[PDB]
DNA sequence: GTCTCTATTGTCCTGG
DNA sequence: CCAGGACAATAGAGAC
């Protein structure tokens, strides 16, 4: 089948806000919720990301650890 | 009912 | 070795 790649710092930090968010405005559609993703994750002091950085990081060596050898091949 | 596009950041792959 | 891309989450909008 199809192995999916793991998120990024951002990617982690954007589930738990677009959550929020999809709570609060929930026929907001999701592509204006990225753009305002984008926007507030330049707000987020660099300090504050550290915590997302490392749950990421963790996430991609569980990720190689589940699947031995799949390489990232997208293609048009 | 079924696909494809919409958008963001970060990260990996390819062509030149 | 750099630019340009695909793609991870997410559901709706639109074509068909």
Request: proline letters at 4%; a negative charge.
């Given at each position: 089948?199809?192995?999916k790649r793991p998120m990024n710092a951002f990617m982690v930090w954007?589930?738990?806000?677009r959550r929020k968010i999809?709570?609060?405005?929930?026929?907001?559609?999701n592509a204006e919720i990225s753009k305002r993703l984008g926007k507030r994750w330049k707000?987020?002091?660099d300090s504050d990301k550290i915590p997302f950085?490392?749950?990421?990081?963790?996430?991609?060596?569980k990720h190689m650890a589940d699947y031995p050898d799949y390489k990232y091949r997208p293609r048009k």
């Open positions: 089948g199809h192995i954007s589930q738990i806000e999809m709570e609060q405005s929930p026929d907001m559609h707000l987020l002091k950085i490392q749950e990421a990081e963790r996430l991609r060596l």
